[PDB]
Amino acid sequence: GMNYLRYSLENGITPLHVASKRGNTNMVKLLLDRGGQIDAKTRDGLTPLHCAARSGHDQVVELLLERGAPLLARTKNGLSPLHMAAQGDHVECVKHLLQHKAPVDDVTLDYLTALHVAAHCGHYRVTKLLLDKRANPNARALNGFTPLHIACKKNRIKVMELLVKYGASIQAITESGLTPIHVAAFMGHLNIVLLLLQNGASPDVTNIRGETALHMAARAGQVEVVRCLKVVTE
C-alpha cells in the first residue's frame, strides 16, 4: 500500500566503464578511438554512459552521446542514464541527455520516471528541470504512486511545492485510495500535511478501508499530525 519500490531504487567491468565513472574525458576518447565498445554492459547492465551520468561527469556524458552511446540502455532494474543522473541531482547530465532526445518519462521496471526518482531523493534542482521539460507530474509508478505521493512519503517539502505548482494532483489516489495527505499523515510529516491543506486538500476524503488521514495518523501513533488534523477539523 505504501510501497512503490519492489526491491530498492538501485564482472563485466571494462576500461570505458572506469574512465567514464572517473570523468577522464581524454582517456574515454582514446579508448573509443582504438575501438573500445561504447555500449558494453556490466553484470547489472550498466553501460559507460550510465557510469558517467551516475557520477555527474557531464562532459564525459556529452562525449559519449556525441559518439553514439545508446541513451535508451537500461539496467536489469530498468534504470536508464537519465534515471541515474536524476538520482545524483546531476543537472547538466540531465540537460545533455534530454538534448539528445532521451524520453523525459522513460520508466524503470517499477514504472518510475526520472521525476519519480528526483522526488524520491528530494532533488529540487533536477525536479524543476524535468518539470520544465514536460515530465508528467501525475505519472503513475508501482501501486499508482505519483511523484507527489512519493515526495509526501519521503518528506520532500521543496519538491512537493514544485510539483504542486506544476500541476500535480492534490487528490490523486494510489491503488488503495491513498491521497497525498493520507500518505503524509500516516508518515507523520506535519509540514507536508499543512502544505496540502493550504493547497486545497480535503482532510475528509477516505481510503478504500474508509479511513481519513486523521484515522491513519492515529493508527500510526503520529502525535503531531493527529493534533494538527484535530485542530483543523474539530
Residue numbers in the entry: 883 to 892, 1265 to 1488
What did the study's authors say about this model?
Ankyrins are a widely expressed scaffold protein family, which mainly function to link great varieties of functionally related but structurally diverse integral membrane proteins to the spectrin-based cytoskeletons. Each ankyrin contains an N-terminal membrane binding domain (MBD), which is composed of 24 ANK repeats and responsible for binding to diverse membrane targets. Following the MBD is an unstructured linker region of ~130 amino acid residues, followed sequentially by a ZU5-ZU5-UPA supramodule responsible for spectrin binding (SBD), a death domain (DD), and an intrinsically disordered C-terminal tail (CT) with varying lengths. We identified three distinct autoinhibitory segments from the intrinsically disordered linker and CT regions of AnkB, and elucidated the inhibition mechanism of these segments by detailed biochemical and structural investigations.
